[model samples]
Target: PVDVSVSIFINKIYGVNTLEQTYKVDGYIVAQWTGKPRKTPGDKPLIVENTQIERWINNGLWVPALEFINVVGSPDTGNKRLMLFPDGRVIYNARFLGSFSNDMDFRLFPFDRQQFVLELEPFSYNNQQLRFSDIQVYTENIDNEEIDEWWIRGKASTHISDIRYDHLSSVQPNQNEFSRITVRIDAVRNPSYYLWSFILPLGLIIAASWSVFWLESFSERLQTSFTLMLTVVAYAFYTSNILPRLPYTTVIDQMIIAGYGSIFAAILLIIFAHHRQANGVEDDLLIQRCRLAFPLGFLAIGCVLVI
Candidate 1:
């Protein structure tokens, strides 16, 4: 009998799927004996291949299995591996390929938050339940932790959720209950790439639309705004093609919509400010003031969003 103690150390958690309602976790488990080491057949640390692992899975060997209790649909799994050490260190590694349950029409510009999550449960071995002494997650990596896709910030509450299923007629009925390890990590839009790549250019286009108001003639103002409208629509199409699809609106997406509304509103106001008057005289007062007003209005909205 191998009396191996297990401890899970979660380094980071991310890649949440809001549509399928699943998330991916990347971490390592330390499985060693609470007492002394034992010498087995493979003293030099035997490597269990996939076939053996699958057999163990069939025979009810407790491996780190990923589960999604809060998920609405099935999640995807990628390359998985399990390594056991003679000194009692077992490492579990796998990639998550799950989709989120988000109501995303990403055909338009601006995509936003779609919560991604992952659930981890231990597979018991030799009637021994894996008791996690302490679990720690590294979430302060956003500022210091340099990663390509992930920008981890502060983490939220973490708790253990005991789960029970009734479909386990083959496995042990009483001991089949598993503990779901819940880790919450919060992330913001990676403005570094998006800001420079998409947002900045979009803002420039919106500003270009504002140039419609600068035209002296009514035909130019109306025609220019109309052209700018088409430009914004084209930009929206371009944005949708590259960005990720999501249900809710993101910060950048909201800004894009604001640009559309602002330009359209300017068109209406510019036309009205001219023709509503008694003569066809140039209404420079209101039109010139609008130049500063629209920018400041956008700035005000942007300022509010940061908080």
Candidate 2:
């Protein structure tokens, strides 16, 4: 088996989308392997540019068909080059830009950690045909860290292994195993914007809702609770518009539901306190005192939800 050593230099990574499960990557790829020795003008390596490489390809030169398995579409290839040495060595270098797919979990949402993945394998070839030996990934650390929304943790991680596909229509089981290279980059989200813009404002609204319980008249309390209910519904609509839609609810969604529940409970108590007692003129001091109790009680419930 011919062992191919590969290296990748990441130039730019941007346009990350959670809902679409896609990310864009622009980079350069290098593949080097041993080939039949050739006589050159000098004992030094001979560099062949793009046009010459294509001519060599037409002349039946052995070039590995490497493909990105996770890429969304065909990659935009830039400059291509070939380096030939007298000591039976060949190097292929190319630049590319493409969108890739990665499975992402955003349950924690604004405080989520995601890994961008790239899978490379030989197209229509098994492990016996071409095997990857060592893969290296080089990425700019400081420049990636300067990004506002996401913080890249460290250098890229790489792995070369054999991947077996069970669903492939192969006559032999061993033929399904293919040589593959996997690249991963870890990143953490910066939650400052979500906290300040959504959570903080939502908390203030919920807090203002509690003030309705302090109203002296039962009519006032009942009227204000409906307004707070409408406000919570409006806020929920606003949140749904901004955040990505998911099959399951997030931590922020739970908090908004709690706000709705609290307002509805206040409405129930206000109506009960007025009608249940024989003296409709006398206000229920016990239920009115619950103004302080409900806020503290909701706070405790909120803490439980977090835990």
TM-score of each: 0.59, 0.90
- Candidate 1 on 156-180: residue-level lDDT in tens? 4466656675566477656665566
lDDT winner: 2
Return model 1's CA RMSD, one decimal. 6.8
- Each prediction's number of clashing residue pairs: 20, 0
What are the candidates' C-alpha RMSDs? Answer: 6.8, 2.3
In model 1, the runs with Cα more than 4 Å from the true position are 1-4, 7-118, 122-145, 153-159, 164-177, 183-189, 242-247, 277-289, 304-306
Best by TM-score: 2
Q: For model 1, what is the C-alpha lDDT against the true structure? A: 0.57
- Name the TM-score of candidate 1: 0.59
Q: Candidate 2: which stretches are off by over 4 Å?
A: 41-44, 141-144, 169-173, 278-282
lDDT of all predictions:
0.57, 0.82
Q: Rate residue 280 of model 1 by lDDT.
A: 56
